Amino acid sequence: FNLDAEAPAVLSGPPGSLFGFSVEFYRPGRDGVSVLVGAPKANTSQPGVLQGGAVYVCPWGTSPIQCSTIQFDSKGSRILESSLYSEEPVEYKSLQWFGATVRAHGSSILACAPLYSWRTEKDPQNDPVGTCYLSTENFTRILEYAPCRSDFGSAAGQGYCQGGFSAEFTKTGRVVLGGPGSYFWQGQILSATQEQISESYYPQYLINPVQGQLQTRQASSVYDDSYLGYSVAVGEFSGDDTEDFVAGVPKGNLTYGYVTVLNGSDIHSLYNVSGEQMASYFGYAVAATDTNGDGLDDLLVGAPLLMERTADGRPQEVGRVYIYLQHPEGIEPTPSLTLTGQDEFGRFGSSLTPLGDLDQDGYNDVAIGAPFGGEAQQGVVFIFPGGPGGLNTKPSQVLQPLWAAGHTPDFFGSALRGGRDLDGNGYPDLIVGSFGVDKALVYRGRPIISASASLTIFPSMFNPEERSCSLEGNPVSCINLSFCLNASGKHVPNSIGFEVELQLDWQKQKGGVRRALFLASKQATLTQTLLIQNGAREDCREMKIYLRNESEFRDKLSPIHIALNFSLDPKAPMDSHGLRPVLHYQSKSRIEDKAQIL
Amino acid sequence: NRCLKANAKSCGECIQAGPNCGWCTNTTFLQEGMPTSARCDDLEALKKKGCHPSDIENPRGSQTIKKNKNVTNRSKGMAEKLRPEDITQIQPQQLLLKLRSGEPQKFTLKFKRAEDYPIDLYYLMDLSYSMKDDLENVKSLGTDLMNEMRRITSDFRIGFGSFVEKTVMPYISTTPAKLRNPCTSEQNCTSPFSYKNVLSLTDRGEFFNELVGQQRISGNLDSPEGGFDAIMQVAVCGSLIGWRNVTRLLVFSTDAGFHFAGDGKLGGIVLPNDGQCHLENNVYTMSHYYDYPSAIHLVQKLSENNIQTIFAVTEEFQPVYKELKNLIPKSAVGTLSGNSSNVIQLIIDAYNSLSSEVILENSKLPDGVTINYKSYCKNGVNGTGENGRKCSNISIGDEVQFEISITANKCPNKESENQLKLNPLGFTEEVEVVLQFICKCNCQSHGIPASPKCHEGNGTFECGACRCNEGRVGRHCECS
Ligand SMILES: *[C@@H]1O[C@H](CO)[C@@H](O)[C@H](O)[C@H]1NC(C)=O
Ligand SMILES: *[C@@H]1O[C@H](CO)[C@@H](O)[C@H](O)[C@H]1NC(C)=O
Ligand SMILES: *[C@@H]1O[C@H](CO)[C@@H](O)[C@H](O)[C@H]1NC(C)=O
Ligand SMILES: *[C@@H]1O[C@H](CO)[C@@H](O)[C@H](O)[C@H]1NC(C)=O
Ligand SMILES: *[C@@H]1O[C@H](CO)[C@@H](O)[C@H](O)[C@H]1NC(C)=O
Ligand SMILES: *[C@@H]1O[C@H](CO)[C@@H](O)[C@H](O)[C@H]1NC(C)=O
Ligand SMILES: *[C@@H]1O[C@H](CO)[C@@H](O)[C@H](O)[C@H]1NC(C)=O
């Protein structure tokens, strides 16, 4: 494949404030297309709150990608004067994370803020309810969504819900929200489309439930400490176009985690598959796309902490991701693939997001990040390629950071999100975040060109006696050499430059007498720049080649090998996005042919 | 033949190619046209072709035991003798074995659990309000353990460590739970703490009673299960605790489950555990910065310290720690009484159950080498088809004899030998096997660099002909 690892095009963040903890695309393939980055521990504007954090939009599209801050809420009016009392005024909002889970689709964006803390009306507490800030229609108005902030707020109720720890916008506009610590730590999934939250918002009620609201019911005390909602995603697991929700339960089923899928218009248990090792953190990162090329999406569950005893027998810390393949019956069976890791402490599977058809063969890629993989344990992001039978174990590109080793881990791949095209050339671009020290990488996907070159000789045999050609008035035996080139590639400029190198009798040792030479150039090698129209018919160049005099060489038995090599022109200008096209890995850059002597 | 397919130039890629592959110092059978490959072939093929027996070089590995100690068998009880002594349980301690690629080198080792081996015990219990009925009696039987465990060994030291939950935001605050228990009049019931050790490993039995009578409790936290960080800091650093290099134990007194790495992310904690001791003034300090150990980061640093952890679980949450038992090698789980009044017999039976079990482990194997395991344990139970690194059901002083075969493979570590240690978990003494491979024939030691036969110095003449330098080919490196 190809994703241009040599030109990272990095962003940057403020010092001492973690950056790129959540990175997402905004208005992809359209005007003002930008990249959103979350910095939960960064400093905000309000003096009252420390480590408030804010997400920064970045107007991507220029060579310098410096960017400012967007202002969700720089206020203190809402928090203060609960029931109008200066004494015991507020439980301070400081240290609240604000960029742990940010996401956006269309023009409406959500910035969930876990670890939000608030004092209930009844009695002073330290309840981590958690809120998500919603802004719609080009930042015209801001909305506040804390569905776990209700009257019955207690550590055994919804007080420690911490809603916002995992969210994603469904394609229909629904906001799907996950609260890991709801109902004495069994978890709760909260979903309600934009219409109800827009209509049912009232600021002065600190407690304002959304009318249309879909939540998981309270479970019995036997399901304590399950953490439902640690990671949630949307898919198409139901046969209908209706999008189903998938959520992983990390510590459910007596520490053997399991992942659930839920019915569309009403929250229900549906299908749900369990982990295979205790304390594996099944469901740390769930994902769902059509990784099979059949139209029905596939699950993807990663378990960062896991066993794999080896020839030595020493246990290691290698995570494996699990592929679950949907079927026309709609039910996911036992695992169908497993892409394990190969690093000592790399939490393989900590992040799992899809890419849509990077090779544009109809098969969608995936990207898995190992925050501590690779040498110097700096972090690695793999890209396994989609295939007819599923993903391939060979991870294609293995992307590594370009910086130097530091005392603190740089947490490469701790947050990523690909999918929708950013540059706009019909080729998706990937993003990664490295919250170690202020490092967010936005990558680019290069165009692919499939090229074919055909070499022909007429006649295939040199006749020493038939000196049909004349060299400076001297009759010489000659045969015709013709080569044709055909190239085709999507989203590529209509004219593509190739470098074509022709070599004669190339297998002769350095210093050996080349038996065949070019008639025009009297040499053994020819280089030429060719411009081939994209998708057009093959361009052919015909040339005549001549054999030297019999006195100049003794070898009439070994055939005269002719080699045809080609690769992209290195001097070709980059595209509008600064990318250089790549030759397909199946393209045979070297074609060899031979002519004999009668 | 594969050795013929190896296309050997030097003795190296003929030794590395295969076990039976061999050279010929005469090199008169070899035809001038045929390349350097044709020399390297099987032993029988060489004698068929007429190469002389001394002219073939096929060194075979062997085992040599440099360090051997007479195992302790001194009489006691029946006859008068001096009791105190030092330790010796494994007879071969340091031995040298030279290896060939594909040679299954084999040796034997023997071990018996020495009687009267001093031990160290450590109590790690959660000072949670669910242990109010257990702390009341546990302090009483500190000296009772001193008296009861006198059968095991002449002397042993025992210390105390306490922990409850963590100071992270999500896991620290309580429900209303209107109890308001007047615990003490001295206001010593301080806030919950990540970890704290009060008494180190000491022989004085009175010290337990004296220093644990002043141990308080933590008040009714909601689902507090923060123990793995404590059992990490205990095992990772032992100089401060005083951890002595004998058969050592650790008691984990628990209620209702535990946490594992990736939970602090709820509380805004992302960095993994360092694996470095952080104990300033006998109390865990670097708690809020680092996350919990994974269940397996615990396994590596528990095994690299020979720590034997004992589990004091209460009836409800037994299955979870039962599966923990199969996860963590060399650990035991025990059903504790409701009032914690059976911890003495629990510890006795748990030590008895651990003692019969000896498990072996190696460290950092080189790439090529692989090790298989067979064990001859007790009378019977000789099984090796199911891999045998364990034996049990042994009595005190019984004999066992494991066998180790080290099978080499394609080996590029020509840096002489590599050191690897085989240690039964729980015992300090280990067998370390200096493991040297053969990457050169003996005739190569006498090779002449820039030899005249090598087209006037264009190669090294060794073992009957010339190894050509870079950029030179031919029988005598005559060509560039
Ligand atoms: C601003 O936020 C940064 C986050 O890295 C923090 O280090 C700094 O102390 C904060 N400063 C103030 C004045 O709050
Ligand atoms: C929406 O906000 C951003 C701010 O620059 C930008 O895309 C644009 O100016 C706004 N929309 C319109 C229609 O102006
Ligand atoms: C819980 O998970 C285990 C896998 O370790 C499985 O064997 C068991 O059947 C599960 N329990 C239920 C009730 O499904
Ligand atoms: C699954 O979702 C549908 C909406 O498409 C809803 O009627 C119900 O919850 C489920 N359908 C059934 C049970 O037929
Ligand atoms: C798993 O799915 C079944 C239905 O398929 C559901 O009834 C059950 O509650 C789920 N597991 C748990 C632990 O809830
Ligand atoms: C105990 O043995 C270990 C070997 O693992 C050694 O490092 C340590 O110094 C020894 N301690 C004493 C007191 O002999
Ligand atoms: C044991 O604990 C129970 C609480 O379940 C208590 O009622 C009982 O009095 C305790 N017994 C002793 C001897 O401490």
Residue numbers in the entry:
A (entry chain P): 94 to 691
B (entry chain Q): 25 to 504
From the paper:
Integrins exist in a continuum of conformations between bent-closed non-ligand-bound (also termed inactive) and extended ligand-bound (also termed active) states. Glycosylation is required for integrin functions. Membrane distal N-glycosylation sites within the β-propeller domain of α5 and at the βI domain of β1 integrins are required for heterodimerization and efficient cell surface expression. For the conformationally switchable cell adhesion glycoprotein α5β1 integrin, we find that only the bent-closed state arranges N-glycans to nucleate the formation of up to tetrameric oligomers of the glycan-binding protein galectin-3.
To explore the molecular mechanism underlying the conformational state-specific dichotomic Gal3 oligomerization process, we set out to reveal the assembly state of Gal3 directly on inactive bent-closed α5β1 integrin via cryogenic electron microscopy (cryo-EM). We first vitrified peptidisc-embedded α5β1 integrin alone and refined the structure of the inactive bent-closed conformation to resolutions of 3.7 Å in the headpiece and 4.7 Å in the leg piece, respectively. A homology model of rat α5β1 integrin86 was fitted individually into the density maps of the headpiece (flexible fit) and leg piece (rigid-body fit). From the glycans of the α5 chain headpiece that point towards the additional cryo-EM density that we ascribed to Gal3, the one at position rN356 (hN307 in human α5) is a Gal3-binding competent complex-type glycan. Based on GlycoSHIELD modeling, it was indeed possible to position another Gal3 CRD for interaction with a galactose residue on the α5-rN356 (α5-hN307) glycan. With α5-rN918 (α5-hN867), α5-rN356 (α5-hN307) constitutes the core glycan pair, which is common to Gal3 dimers, trimers, and tetramers that all bridge the head and leg pieces of bent-closed α5β1 integrin (top, blue dashed line zoom). Our structural data pointed to the intriguing possibility that Gal3 oligomers might physically bridge membrane-proximal (leg piece) and distal (headpiece) parts of α5β1 integrin that face each other in the inactive bent-closed conformer. α5β1 integrin in its bent-closed state would thereby be stabilized by a Gal3-mediated clamping effect. Specifically, it appears that only on bent-closed α5β1 integrin N-glycans from head and leg pieces are arranged such that Gal3 oligomerization can be nucleated (left). In contrast, in extended ligand-bound α5β1 integrin, these glycans are too distant from each other to enable such oligomerization (right). We think that our structural determination of the first example of Gal3 nucleation on spatially arranged N-glycans in the inactive bent-closed state of α5β1 integrin provides a guide for the N-glycan arrangement pattern needed to nucleate Gal3 oligomers and ultimately for predicting glycoproteins that are capable of doing so.
